[PDB]
Ligand binder design. Sequence first.
Ligand code: 2ID
Ligand code: ZN
Length: 346
Amino acid sequence: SSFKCALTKTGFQFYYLPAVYILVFIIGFLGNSVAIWMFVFHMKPWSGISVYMFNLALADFLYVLTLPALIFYYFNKTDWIFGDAMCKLQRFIFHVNLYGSILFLTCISAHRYSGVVYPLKSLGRLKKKNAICISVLVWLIVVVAISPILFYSGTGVRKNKTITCYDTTSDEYLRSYFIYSMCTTVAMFCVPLVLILGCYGLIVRALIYKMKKYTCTVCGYIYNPEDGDPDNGVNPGTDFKDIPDDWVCPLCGVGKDQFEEVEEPLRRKSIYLVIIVLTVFAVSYIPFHVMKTMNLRARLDFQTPAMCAFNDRVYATYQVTRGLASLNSCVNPILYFLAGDTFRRR
Ligand SMILES: CNc1nc(I)nc2c1ncn2[C@H]1C[C@H](OP(=O)(O)O)[C@]2(COP(=O)(O)O)C[C@H]12
Ligand SMILES: [Zn+2]
């Protein structure tokens, strides 16, 4: 007989995961409701960034709205009572949010990269129209790519007579599902992650190289390392700290001590982007994608009595990493502030 391992459902699933979802739900609702208000009604002129970020706030918000049912499902010992159609919807909206977020973060990273590494030369490519078209596509690519989940997922009856809402699919269709899940993880997670780390290295590199500008607090004259002050014997490409003390402002004659660092908004936002997005990937996206795959494998290839112990640890970890996937929806809001365009700047 086709031996099936015995599985173990912990208190994390029935009691403690739904509690976390309640917190995500509340904070997520607040964070993104406010964010959406700030974009739609206070940011225009939107740069391409605000276009992308608005799309994130939009997808996180709609996702959060699916939490109550998920919360109810775990409180109800994972017995799903809203039927097949709503199960498929729950899972569909989860993965659309998941992969939409990933791609939008890629666009945001790409956007910021071009603006940082090619400041004078990308202007046309970074305009808002392009951002809107890219955003439409991103939704098209995701909906198309994730649509099979409407087939694969859905409702099923357990031996104990309670109803399961598959997040993946039932045994009869697992093989093809595995192949499908491999494609999306490769195309809509692995590739992006590579593109993102690409951008990020280049961005950091350009930021560490770019010499700081300084400004005369007495007459406003900006010193640009790129131009230097050739007419007074400072060559193009000299750093302000390398200028001998005896130099003075060439416009009014005050000393170096009267100068101050020019605050470069784009450098700060780029670093806040890197830090936040790498954190999010390490806590929410990577562990989930590792564990989704291992857990499918376990279900297919590692189904023997020797493995079962290891297997329900995998299943157990999978549950936590699936819960950790939801944290982007109440962390992304800090992105919109710290890494997005500044309110007015005028
Ligand atoms: C180590 N992974 C699994 N091993 C065994 I045996 N059964 C598993 C494993 N992972 C999931 N299952 C069962 C059990 C699981 O149902 P349940 O809601 O956990 O009772 C299920 C798929 O759930 P999901 O991954 O689509 O969210 C029908 C499968
Ligand atoms: Zn001056």
